[PDB]
Design a protein around this nucleic acid. Structure first.
Lengths: 78, 100, 82, 94, 95, 99, 81, 79
DNA sequence: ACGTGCCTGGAGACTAGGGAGTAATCCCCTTGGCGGTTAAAACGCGGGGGACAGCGCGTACGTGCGTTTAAGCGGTGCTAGAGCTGTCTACGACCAATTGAGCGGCCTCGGCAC
DNA sequence: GTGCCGAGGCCGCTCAATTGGTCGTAGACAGCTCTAGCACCGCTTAAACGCACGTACGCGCTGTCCCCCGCGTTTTAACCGCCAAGGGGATTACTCCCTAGTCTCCAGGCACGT
């Protein structure tokens, strides 16, 4: 597990979010594994865009403004 | 009375993918009222060609890593190391593709 | 019920994800921003998955609900079709 | 009940391109997802193409135009060639 | 002796309902037609997908409601669902 | 003999055509069957969205001392409302000005 | 016809950039913008010509362009009739 | 509506020159060219908005080819 | 990883009908030419705003290490709910007759530009 | 105060929406099964965490020079109007051939066993 996101905390976070949409919801294990895989892919792609924004400002340290710029150019809702 | 030996439409077209299943899927899916005779054959040929291309590049990746089997990492490498397949399958997330 | 579990994605996990994306150095203010971004993304996906589940009269979220919710974002996911 | 899948046809194509290579079950699942995704993309594009021209029938001409719209560059040329070859052989074969 | 259909008269009726003294140009009429058409195809396609996911052959008001929830954001979705439910209730109560 | 014909839009209290919406749903290759309440629901939703956009655009035109809605006012209404902008953000309005 | 991308003049690019909020423009921006526009137009026109060829037509119509743009994820209102 | 001139005749010549590499003896409806021009306007204005965002990030006021390249790379457009 | 039974989806043959291919016609809308005349672009110049390299400082990040925390695993049990089968009834498709809604062409004069 | 044109109102017709009746079947609901999601517990050990510390790097400041902007002048080519030609899109009518549907048969693909 190179990109180790731990199972139990992620499952608890997934359950917490779903409580705001429907009460007493169940989850298959494969549904949580799909959510975790999507989260990994999304975050790796966003960190790649963030690193391009940092290099463009002649930096090696990624900063929150880089993430904001990448997400704005992508068109993601702030 | 004397029915000839049944010949699959896949064998008539020289294909490995099932023409009859592709025809049934086209009819069932509410894509159009009617489906022509050659549309399932064309679709099955295209699908088989794309499958062959991806499996060839995944086998090359498996061979370059000295493994005798294809794993999802080899499919991810094959997709991302070809310009056309990256253009076709760039927005796609492969399970276990990055990490094994 | 336990809440504030977004802290469950730890700083070393974010560091590992960022190093796989090519990042060499990470500011200390990146982690909270990353947690917020992940929360927003997860909220959108889980909202559409729960809508798909509620339509089907079910009480359990399946892998196909997540796949359908992700697809209609434009984030197709392979390997959960069966 | 009985889920139909492309595993045996993908395995036949694999033994044609790499006769000594195998494939894991997870890779077969990714290949199944890929085949389904491509089938639904092409069929949807062909269905839209038929409706634009006020037609009721999806023929090989709609499939060819869908392949040219969806596949990029070199991929479209070879897919079109393979489809035309299959249709010609099927038409000759009684 | 031929026709092509559009939503111009209904958009005009709604416009007179909301802004009695305001008019609309033909260019804006074309924009409104394109908008209505686009939203119709979006909702119809989502409803068709929803019916296919559940192995159903009938598109009902439940499919339309779920599609509207999927496609429209936030308060727009909440108000549209309220309007659709109100209209369906009024329709079914009648005769 | 039969009763006087009443349009379904009048029955549902709508301005949009329920019968035209039903015909388009049946023609469109969306499903094998179409329920009775589906066209009513769809017409109600379309009428609501049209009313929202025309309200905002009429407000925008009024703020310009103009009594007639032009594509510029529709563009302003779409881009000045957060919900409409999220719904209609990837859309180009002809002659609307790209801001 | 060979050199027509130069018909997108430097003042036109300056106007488009000003409308997008740009205050100062480097002198190397114009060739890059012309190349970007050429790529975009090539993609759109290729898909529109495919649509036209499917219909046995010789004239590209506004609906072909609207369909080509729609499948890029760029939706153009006001040319459907 | 707030005029933003791309001249019709050079753009038409450009569209005809581009299209002749896909099919010879092609006609263009006038509304097709108008739609293409409107799409080009919108696309370029939005790209310059992203380019100006990228230029400010580097503490500049002058947009440069590298800003366009970064904006298009983040957008996902092919180089 | 290969052999085997069976059972369900594919293939064969025939018929009816309507979808689509083809020919003919017309009229409309795209393409080309020519002249003038004017708005827009191209060009040169001068100045100053801004891009960029160099430098110093101080602060915050990466690394290492000992300690703490809680995740993972295996086992057990419970019980909700998903998937399947069977029945029956309401509901939507289909057809035929009726009629009013809606579309196109014409007439008018108002909100804007000059 | 005057002139423009485009948007609003009116009428005839015609075709698509409405109403009524019939009937086949899709789906709603009940009952059952048995799977898999959830909760608890104890133990281990991997991973996170908290602190210290050195140094790489972010950021502010300064100075130079280059190259963009604004302005005035000349050029050039878009554009509008008018005319002509002709290609080709849209419509209609006829025909024939291709696809749906039904019934029969069987062979390929999947669960079980070895």
């Amino acid at each position: 597990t190179e990109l180790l996101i731990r199972k139990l905390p992620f499952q608890r976070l997934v359950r917490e979010i779903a409580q705001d949409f429907k009460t007493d919801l169940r989850f298959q294990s494969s549904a949580v594994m799909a959510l975790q895989e999507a989260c990994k892919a999304y975050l790796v792609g966003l960190f790649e865009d963030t690193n391009l924004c940092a290099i463009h400002a002649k930096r090696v340290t990624i900063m929150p403004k880089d993430i904001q710029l990448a997400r704005r150019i992508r068109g993601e809702r702030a | 009375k004397a029915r000839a030996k049944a010949k699959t439409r896949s064998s008539r077209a020289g294909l490995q993918f099932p023409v009859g299943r592709v025809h049934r899927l086209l009819r069932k899916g509410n894509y159009s009222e009617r489906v022509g005779a050659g549309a399932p054959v064309y679709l099955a040929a295209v699908l088989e060609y794309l499958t062959a291309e991806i499996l060839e590049l995944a086998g090359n990746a498996a061979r370059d890593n000295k493994k005798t089997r294809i794993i999802p990492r080899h499919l991810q490498l094959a997709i991302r190391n070809d310009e056309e397949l990256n253009k076709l399958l760039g927005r796609v997330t492969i399970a276990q593709g990055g990490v094994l | 019920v336990l809440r504030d579990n977004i802290q469950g994605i730890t700083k070393p996990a974010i560091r590992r994800l960022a190093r796989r994306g090519g990042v060499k150095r990470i500011s200390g203010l990146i982690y909270e921003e990353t947690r917020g971004v992940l929360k927003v993304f997860l909220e959108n996906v889980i909202r559409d998955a729960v809508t798909y589940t509620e339509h089907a009269k079910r009480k359990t979220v399946t892998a196909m609900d997540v796949v359908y919710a992700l697809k209609r974002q434009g984030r197709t996911l392979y390997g959960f079709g069966g | 009940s009985r889920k139909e899948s492309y595993s045996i046809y993908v395995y036949k194509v694999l033994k044609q391109v790499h006769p000594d290579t195998g494939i894991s079950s997870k890779a077969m699942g990714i290949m199944n997802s890929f085949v389904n995704d491509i089938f639904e993309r092409i069929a949807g594009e062909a269905s839209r193409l038929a409706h634009y021209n006020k037609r009721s029938t999806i023929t090989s001409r709609e499939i060819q135009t869908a392949v040219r719209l969806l596949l990029p560059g070199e991929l479209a040329k070879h897919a079109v060639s393979e489809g035309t070859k299959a249709v010609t052989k099927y038409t000759s074969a009684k």
